[PDB]
Structure formats: structure tokens, C-alpha cells
Design a protein around this ligand. Structure first.
Ligand SMILES: [K+]
Ligand SMILES: [K+]
Ligand SMILES: [K+]
Ligand SMILES: [K+]
Ligand SMILES: [K+]
Ligand SMILES: [K+]
Lengths: 331, 331
């Protein structure tokens, strides 16, 4: 007895974006009263001058819902037409149900496939690749993809090497079917023999500690930069090639905003010409993990650094170690 | 300027399975020293006579790895050929890196795409559909899918309406490219307006509580039953239809093992003939959430209740509410 399948038919494309950063502006000046560091060391080492933190009223569910509502309104779709929602996060601290289910309820989605994905800072790029595959194999038609984090809660203010890095926010995109390729092939993988490079504390350990609520982020920044400069840069070049273009065909490069030095060294490895606009939004954003790429897409489009129809290389890389990147056409 | 996508070819199929449950046998007799119930009542309500809990040395990482090692050995692949690992769980209580990354490191995987998926008890069927889509669109070739849970840590022994339900274990499967379809179209979705039916506590709440380590499961079982009988049964019928077969063409029916009465009403709604073997392994399994379906597949194959080449409808359903099911050919 044979099993019938749906065809692989057509492609997919971004239809719209939206973002909702944390509302609290934390300058390096204010940061240096919370940690022992200086504002010009921070800016020198990372390019960060300020970052956004969520207030106590901005949860990953409310930020994710806000970003998604903006994407929905801009897409011209009705909420009833969304039939998949994917949320990339490490900040949904409830085991079950998923943050996708909570956001689906706020939006009043109907019969939508709904799941959370944990791909660390690569999660939005992981989720984009999946959305494209789902649409092309007919298991979804309009996919809401959200990267959302609230890293301030897990930031170690006694760790001067990392306290100044992390920020809070959501970015969202709606992906739909397309006659022409709008999402190029994903180049993704992992380096799990390097797992100890970025590790968060486990919740049972935090829970037993009477002096803390949340687990803390730990990061070996020098190992991270070496990996980003060496191996991630090569995966980015592969993602461009798999899309059937050269670096000079790109209009914009939007890496995960981990460090200005990382962004710069990958740009040079790719030998990007002056015509390629490179995202340096880390300046007022810091590191928002899986929310980094979709926030930056939205904001670059908003300020005219990027335009509809531009080709953008997006790539995320983070704890695991994991990575994922692809070329997309901006909506 | 255009971009391209990877050449599409073929389908996918299960190559092997493996499973590893917790070693601690908790009979209904022992359960009724912990809660105010009787073994007769538990069995009449659910069909459970015993369940497995993990010992303190059995973690989701160690059980997940053991199940995966068994599946890997049975498949005839080298570990180095796995290029995606998907872990479906609500029991990985570390924000980052993912459980997929920890297990990838234990197995010595190389450059494999690696992510955790939260689809509640539907998680294995969600991950199966994604693996199939990934393979068919060329982003992976051999996908390791693991459903693993340690729900005993989140079981409320003061809640006699749920404490007898939950269990611990891992089930694993390796999925690979195929010339003919081994996995039918997914039928999946959610009913997020019913979210309040199953909610686990937030980790920050558990962390703040001086007398608690883990958050606890809360469940409205009778709302779950009404939903499973009336709505999930219809989705099960659709997944059979989508595969181009009738219920009589099935060899096996393997729903998520949540309640024997749920299994039976869905069987009768589908009008399964006598030749269809129905999984009722809840009898000594209990409810192992996303691990339920891959453990049942593996154990049914082991005891000769199911056979290589059988057509099986697998369906998962859980908190969200979410569901996912498909017809597969057993390895
Ligand atoms: K979670
Ligand atoms: K605590
Ligand atoms: K450090
Ligand atoms: K987790
Ligand atoms: K606690
Ligand atoms: K109850």
C-alpha cells in the first residue's frame, strides 16, 4: 500500500516585518553604575553605546505579540489566515505550553501549527528555513516567525565581561508562498564539541539558590570571536554561494549583532564591496540573541538602510555551538 | 537579481527506532501511598497500572542519548552521517544551549543542524513532519528525532487528579531520504483559545518558592477528554485521508498514550477494523508526553505487536492545545 504526499511546489517569501524592543533605554553611563566598567571600554570592545531592556510589564509574550501584530497589520492578511507560528527563544521560562501557543491565543489565531524552537542566537534563521520548507511542502501557507528574548533577567551584573552585552525585544516576520525564490537555502549546523563556550545555568540550580531567581549567562567571549571569525565566516560565504549569487550581489548583510568586531571581520572575509550595507545596529541595541536579526531587518527597513526587494544575507550563531544563515529578499 | 534553491528529490522514511525509559517502576500500589486514591480507580479512569520514573542519575540528556544510540546502531549509519538532530521536550530545564546540543556532543555528531522543539505531547509528530520536510527540500539527509521527558519532577503529588498520570523516558528515530514515501502529510494545528486546559507553572514562580524546586503540572483532564474525543479524532481521520488511504489500510494505530478511553473513542470514531492493532501501552507506560509515540513504536516493534513495513497512524496532542499526526511506514 502506497502513501501519498503533498507535492513540493513553489517557494516562499517574507511578506512583512515588525519589532517591539524593550522600552527602557540603558546607556553605558547608567550601565557603569550597575557594573564595574567604563562607557568607553564598552564602546571600544563592542560598539555598544546603549541597549534596550524590557520593563516588568514587557514579557516575552507581550513583546512577541506586539511585534507580530505589527507584522500582521503590514501584511494585509487576516489573523485567521495564519496557519503556523514559530517562536525562537531561550527566554520562555515556562515548560509548557509553548510561547507560540500563548502568542497564538493573544492574536486569536485559529487552527495554526504552533511550536517553540531553541536554536540559541541562531533561532530566527533556523525558524525561517523551517517556515520555507513547511510552505513549500504544503503543510502551511502563512507562517508567523518570531524571535524574542528577555536576556536582562539572565544577565550577570557581577560579570563585567558580559553584563554590558545583552538586551530584550522581539522581532517578527510573516512568510508566505511565492512564485519565485524569496528565501535561499539554509546553511546550518553545530559544533557541539565546543558546547562549553556558552552555557547558561540550569533552572534547578537557580531555583535552589535563595539569593537569585533566574539562571545566569556565561560566555567565553574570546572563544566566541575566534569561532565567529574562523568558521562562521565560512558558513556565511557558503550561504551566499548556495543562493546562487556573489557577495557583490547582496544589498545588505545582517548578522546576529554579537560584537562590532565580529561583524567587521566577517564582512572582510566575505570581501563585501562598498555597495553592501552592513548592519551595525548593536550600537543602540546590544545583543538580543534570537531576536537580533528580525529586529535589525525591521529597523533597517524602517530607517531606509534597506529597501523592499533587496537581497540580504541573514545569519545567526550562538550557544551549542549552533549556526544558521540564508539569503532572503526583503519585503 | 534572482536567488536559487536546492534541487528537490524524493521523500523520506523511518530507518530505525530506539527507546530508554526511566528505571524506577512505580506501581499503582506505590502511587496510592503517595496520593489519596486506589489502584482500581486509577486503572478504571486511565488504563494505567504502572509507570516508569527516572532515577536521579537518569537525566533527559542521558535517556535521550541512550535511545539515540540504540536507533543509531540499528540504522547502520555512522554518527558522522547524521546532519540534523531534533529534540522534542518540555523537560530541558536549562535555557541554553539546547538539549539537542548536549546529546549531539554525547554522540559525537559533527556538523549537524541542532534544535529543541516545544510541541508539548505533540512534539514528536511535529518533529517528524519537519524532518520529512527538511529532507525533501535538501537541508538535511539523515535526521535524528528524539522525544524525551522527565515529567515526574513536575508532577504534583498533592494533586490526586493528575499525580498518577506522568512518566519519564526517551524515544528516538532516525529518518532518511527515500525514493518512495515513508511519511505521509502532516495534519497539525492548535486550539490556543483552550490554552488554560493544561498549564505548567512558570520557572520564576518555582524558583522564588522556598519549598519547591520544579514547576508543577496542572491539567483539566475532562476538558482534555472532550477535546480529544471530538476534535483530535477528526484530525486523526484527516491524516489518514491525506495519506490517500482508508482506516482499513492501516496496520497499526499509535496515538500519544494519554488515556485508554481517549485511545478507544478515537479508534471507534475512525471505525478501525479488527485487523488494525491499537497501542494501549499506557497500561505500563503512563503519560510520557513527547516521548510517548516513539517509545510505543519501539516497544511494539520489539514485542512483535507491530512489524517492519506496517502502515501506522501516529498522532500527538497536548498542551496549547496543539496536535500533529501523520501516517508512517514502520522501519
Ligand atoms: K520553555
Ligand atoms: K531561587
Ligand atoms: K567571560
Ligand atoms: K529549555
Ligand atoms: K525554589
Ligand atoms: K485537575
Amino acid at each position: 500500500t502506497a502513501i501519498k504526499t503533498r507535492p513540493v511546489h513553489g517557494y516562499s517569501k517574507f511578506l512583512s516585518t515588525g519589532s517591539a524592543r524593550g522600552s527602557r533605554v540603558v546607556t553605558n553611563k547608567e550601565m557603569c553604575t550597575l557594573i564595574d566598567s567604563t562607557p568607553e571600554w564598552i564602546e571600544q570592545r563592542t560598539g555598544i553605546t546603549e541597549r534596550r531592556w524590557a520593563t516588568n510589564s514587557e514579557t516575552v509574550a507581550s513583546m512577541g505579540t506586539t511585534a507580530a501584530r505589527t507584522a500582521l497589520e503590514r501584511s494585509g492578511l487576516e489573523a485567521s489566515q495564519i496557519d503556523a507560528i514559530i517562536v525562537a527563544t531561550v527566554s520562555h521560562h515556562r515548560p509548557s505550553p509553548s510561547l507560540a501557543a500563548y502568542i497564538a491565543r493573544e492574536l486569536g489565531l485559529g487552527d495554526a501549527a504552533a511550536f517553540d524552537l531553541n536554536g540559541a542566537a541562531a533561532g530566527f534563521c533556523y525558524s525561517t528555513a523551517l517556515a520555507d520548507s513547511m510552505i513549500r511542502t504544503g503543510s502551511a501557507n502563512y507562517v508567523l516567525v518570531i524571535g524574542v528574548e528577555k536576556l536582562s533577567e539572565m544577565t550577570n551584573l557581577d560579570d563585567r565581561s558580559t553584563a554590558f552585552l545583552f538586551s530584550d525585544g522581539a522581532g517578527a516576520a510573516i512568510i508566505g508562498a511565492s512564485d519565485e525564490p524569496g528565501i535561499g537555502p539554509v546553511v546550518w549546523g553545530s559544533r557541539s564539541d565546543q558546547l562549553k563556550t556558552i552555557e547558561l545555568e540550569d533552572w534547578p540550580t537557580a531555583s535552589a539558590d535563595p539569593n537569585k531567581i533566574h539562571p545566569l549567562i556565561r560566555m567565553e567571549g574570546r572563544a566566541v570571536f575566534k569561532w565567529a571569525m574562523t568558521d562562521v565566516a565560512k558558513r556565511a560565504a557558503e550561504a551566499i554561494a548556495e543562493a546562487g549569487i556573489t557577495p557583490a550581489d547582496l544589498d545588505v548583510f545582517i548578522p546576529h549583532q554579537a560584537n562590532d568586531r565580529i561583524t567587521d571581520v566577517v564582512s572582510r572575509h566575505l570581501k563585501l564591496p562598498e555597495s553592501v550595507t552592513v548592519c551595525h545596529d548593536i550600537a543602540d541595541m546590544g545583543n538580543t540573541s534570537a531576536a537580533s536579526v528580525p529586529i535589525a531587518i525591521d529597523r533597517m527597513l524602517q530607517r531606509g538602510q534597506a529597501h523592499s526587494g533587496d537581497l540580504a544575507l541573514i545569519i545567526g550563531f550562538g550557544a551549542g555551538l549552533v549556526y544558521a544563515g540564508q539569503v532572503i529578499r526583503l519585503p
